[PDB]
């Protein structure tokens, strides 16, 4: 049977965790552990400046308090899950992970498996809200497949799926990410003398053929790997402005 | 061993390690020298914050009476998303990061809140400078040579992303140089250190990074080692399309056949 350490970046209660949870508990072993609440926008961070304490559930799953998505996997592989996990996926994430936006999102950062990236890492987010099954298969596709035929290229696995049902979708394709512009706005709202401040929605759409976000546009199920030289040209510049040298 | 030139531009300065914290208020007051500085940085030590931004909840602004805007409950990515399009008014020329108490040397980058701090995404603000202090009894001797580059950058500017800089932690009198390096590398960071409270619970806390994999000449790690000031150009990455492809038909996934 095949180990399961689940995550995503909206907290162990979310709708769609505990929709992939159940849907991936009959074939395999799943040990969720999940942050406290939502961290959307969490990404890389990782709690190094305070102590993290966790709440076990009484149907095995751990919660992180104050955790991100990144110390569920840190946490969980390292201490929390014995035996060690063979696959860790993050989702399913409520919202796309479409474009360059990847890498500020909670859930495609989950795959944050370096150390136990034995598995490829599996960050499956939802076009919409509505159909966490349809989302759920897709993912019990996928892993069915990395049981019977296991993947060398540990490039992280990011999967969007679209917001129809089952049937409604057209089929898988390979895509490389897209781009969207950077968020200039800021959302401006009074309380009961001050101001806050929101992090605007990021910007219009730069570039969507082979990208993230046409595959979805269309009906198909966009993935993507993803990772992580002008030594020169810094080198003269420093001589040229004389910096680092007397002359 | 370095003088303010008279160029009056325009800087957006923040760190992991809040308004506060000795290193950034060092930095703040040497580069007041002969720039015009607006300090937006976060309300607490944020080490280890990243590109992370608080996309699910408002942030509050505490502005000081000495011109400094701290966020509460804010990141050092959201001090310079917030800064750029919002608060400094008028914009920055260059966004620099720092100083952090701490070095940040190898693949601890993608983790660091100052690194991420130091992020041209917005606009073309930077190359913004990353600065890190390998130590914590210097402050002055990174800001001097934050100071010459800053300088340098007024003198001639550089296109194409951002600047990594790793200051060891002596008198400026005893620095050897600089050295423009390549980001080395760790063995992943591991540990996780188990406390137990007075209630019977343990809480844990995320350990250390790991040891250093890669260590030599044109590394980031050697050269504070000797003694030089670290420069680094760091980019981030999005190949094997065609393996994937052949994989999700081998297994039969997406496909009915």
Same mark, same amino acid.
């Given at each position: ?50 102590? +993290?304490?966790?709440?076990?559930? =009484?149907?095995?799953?751990?919660? &992180?308090?104050?955790?991100?998505? #990144?110390? !569920? ?83 992280? +696995?990011?999967?969007?799926?679209? =917001?129809?049902?089952?049937?409604? &979708?057209?089929?898988?394709?390979? #895509?490389? !990410? ?70």
């Amino acid at each position: 049977s095949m180990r399961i350490l689940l995550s995503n970046d909206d907290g162990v209660h979310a709708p769609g965790i505990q929709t992939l949870a159940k849907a991936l508990r009959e074939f395999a072993d799943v040990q969720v552990v999940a942050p406290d609440r939502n961290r959307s926008g969490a990404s890389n961070s990782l709690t190094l400046e305070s102590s +993290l304490r966790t709440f076990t559930f =009484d149907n095995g799953d751990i919660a &992180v308090q104050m955790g991100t998505p #990144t110390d !569920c996997v840190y946490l969980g592989v390292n201490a929390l899950m014995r035996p060690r996990p063979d696959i860790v996926v993050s989702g399913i994430n409520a919202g796309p992970n479409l474009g360059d936006d990847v890498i500020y999102s909670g859930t495609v950062a989950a795959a944050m498996a370096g150390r136990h990236l034995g598995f490829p890492a599996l960050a499956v987010s939802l076009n919409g809200y509505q159909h966490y099954d349809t989302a759920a298969a897709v993912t019990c596709a996928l892993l069915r497949g990395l049981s019977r035929e296991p993947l060398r290229t540990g490039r992280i +696995l990011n999967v969007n799926v679209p =917001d129809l049902p089952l049937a409604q &979708v057209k089929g898988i394709r390979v #895509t490389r !990410c897209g781009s969207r512009h950077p968020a200039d706005k800021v959302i401006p709202q009074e309380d009961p003398g001050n101001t806050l401040y929101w992090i605007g929605p990021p910007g219009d759409k730069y570039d969507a053929p082979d990208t993230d976000f046409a595959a979805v546009d269309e009906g198909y199920v966009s993935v993507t790997p993803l990772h992580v030289s002008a030594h020169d040209v810094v080198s003269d510049w420093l001589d040229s402005v004389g910096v680092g040298t007397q002359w």
